[PDB]
Amino acid sequence: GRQPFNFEGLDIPVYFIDKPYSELELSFVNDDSPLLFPEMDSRLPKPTPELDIKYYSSNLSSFKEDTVILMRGTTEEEAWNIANYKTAGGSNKDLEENFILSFSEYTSSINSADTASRKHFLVIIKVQVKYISNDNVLYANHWAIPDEAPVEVLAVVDRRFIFPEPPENVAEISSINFRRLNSGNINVLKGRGVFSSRRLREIYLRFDAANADELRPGDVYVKKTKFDSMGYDSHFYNEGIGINGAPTLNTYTGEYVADSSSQGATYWLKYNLTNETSIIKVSNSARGANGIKIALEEIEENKPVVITSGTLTGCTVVFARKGEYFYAVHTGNSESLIGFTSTSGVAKAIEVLSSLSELEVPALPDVINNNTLVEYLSDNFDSALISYSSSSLKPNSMINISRENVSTFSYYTDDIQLPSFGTSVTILVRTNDNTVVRSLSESYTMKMVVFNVLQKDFSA
Ligand SMILES: [Cl-]
Ligand SMILES: [Mg+2]
Ligand SMILES: [Mg+2]
Ligand SMILES: [Mg+2]
Ligand SMILES: [Mg+2]
Ligand code: NA
Ligand code: NA
Numbered sequence: 001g002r003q004p005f006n007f008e009g010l011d012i013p014v015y016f017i018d019k020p021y022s023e024l025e026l027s028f029v030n031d032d033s034p035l036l037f038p039e040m041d042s043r044l045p046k047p048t049p050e051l052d053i054k055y056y057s058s059n060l061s062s063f064k065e066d067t068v069i070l071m072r073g074t075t076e077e078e079a080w081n082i083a084n085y086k087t088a089g090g091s092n093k094d095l096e097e098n099f100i101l102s103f104s105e106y107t108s109s110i111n112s113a114d115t116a117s118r119k120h121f122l123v124i125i126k127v128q129v130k131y132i133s134n135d136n137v138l139y140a141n142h143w144a145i146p147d148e149a150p151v152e153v154l155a156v157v158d159r160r161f162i163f164p165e166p167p168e169n170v171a172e173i174s175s176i177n178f179r180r181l182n183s184g185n186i187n188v189l190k191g192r193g194v195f196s197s198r199r200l201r202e203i204y205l206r207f208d209a210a211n212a213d214e215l216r217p218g219d220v221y222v223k224k225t226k227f228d229s230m231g232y233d234s235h236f237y238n239e240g241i242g243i244n245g246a247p248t249l250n251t252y253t254g255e256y257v258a259d260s261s262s263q264g265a266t267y268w269l270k271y272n273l274t275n276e277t278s279i280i281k282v283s284n285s286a287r288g289a290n291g292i293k294i295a296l297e298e299i300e301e302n303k304p305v306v307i308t309s310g311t312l313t314g315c316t317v318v319f320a321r322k323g324e325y326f327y328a329v330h331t332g333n334s335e336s337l338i339g340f341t342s343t344s345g346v347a348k349a350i351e352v353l354s355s356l357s358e359l360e361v362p363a364l365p366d367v368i369n370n371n372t373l374v375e376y377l378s379d380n381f382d383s384a385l386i387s388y389s390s391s392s393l394k395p396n397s398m399i400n401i402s403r404e405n406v407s408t409f410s411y412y413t414d415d416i417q418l419p420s421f422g423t424s425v426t427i428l429v430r431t432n433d434n435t436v437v438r439s440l441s442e443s444y445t446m447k448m449v450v451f452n453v454l455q456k457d458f459s460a
Helices: 050-058 076-085 095-099 110-117 170-182 344-356 370-380
Strands: 014-017 067-074 103-107 121-128 142-146 152-158 208-213 221-223 249-254 274-282 287-295 305-308 316-322 325-333 383-389 406-412 421-431 434-445 449-457
Touching: 050 067, 067 076, 067 110, 067 142, 076 121, 076 152, 103 110, 110 121, 170 274, 170 421, 208 344, 274 287, 274 325, 287 344, 316 344, 316 370, 316 421, 316 434, 325 344, 325 421, 344 370, 370 383, 370 406, 383 421, 383 434, 383 449, 406 421, 406 434, 406 449
Parallel strands: 014 152, 274 305, 383 406
Antiparallel strands: 067 103, 067 121, 103 142, 121 152, 208 221, 208 287, 249 274, 287 325, 305 421, 316 325, 316 383, 421 434, 434 449
């Protein structure tokens, strides 16, 4: 093989070997650990908040000499070279040699560092602001640093989890939940509340993903590569959510179904679907739509897939089938734009649906509203479900037509006593030699309980 790198002679204040869950409820998860999630291990220095880094970098004359703390997932060899040469890219060339630029990207996102370092190495550095920039990064919360820039290495953690394979009833109930899902029974997700996570884990399934947002006029962004451990694609990220921002489209595995970012979650904070379940979270874009297209023949036996839209409080979720492909689109806005979702949001959803289905956008009326979405879906897809919020006060939100191939679920109406929220989810399961596809939309009221539902099957 290749000689193991020996870190003992290096200048590393904090160096240790990370233990996976299986070596410490998740006693069978041998390729992940709680090092960074949900709480960053107390041995590790914490990164500088993204907003503070942006503040320093935006006032460079005032803070060029000050430092920030950043994280990175790297290989064994990269981590050793960073710690040995004390430069951002593990280079021993002098910075001056560039002026007679190669860059490495670090992150302020704990979840991003978790994703990148799992099964590899975590490196934490302190670096002066004059060496960082984010002008050309593709991933959220990333900062490029010249490979030759000096850094102070604060921690290196070996997260390769090289350990002999493992030979309140949370584990047992979660295994039953997996068996229920894996049978193709949508009832496992009924009534147990909303779920979402900001975690990023690559799942087995590749799918087309698209984004249309008013921040980027004149373009629909299309991603056909896997959602992988490099980080959070900035097109599927919303810097305005909370403090460090949040992803608007991410995949994770079912050992965590909801985390503390899921507004209103209950049952799925406690129990899970095991890490054999693959979950795709599709949220709205800041001012527009995110969508995915799944090839039903690529769902694999004993690897069920769950799509969740998170907590619905005004946004529109579309599930649809055309041929051998399933579509999920979530449109709306995070900027409290009254009337956007039932008008511009519909237009953005149609842009995404047309892009994913490889159709030219059809001719649309001058006034685009939720009825327009019903018509578009009816004419261009085999079957569809719209889950949406309507009020007699906002006429554009009201759906007053019907099409035989389009179901609609108003998870909010004026008849609802707040507080309330909606959910909309789909399961895709290869069982009995076919791909079962079942969708479920719910309204929750009041401890929140479901009082209104629509269940739609998209399989034969
Ligand atoms: Cl991953
Ligand atoms: Mg990283
Ligand atoms: Mg490695
Ligand atoms: Mg129950
Ligand atoms: Mg949510
Ligand atoms: Na183990
Ligand atoms: Na050294």
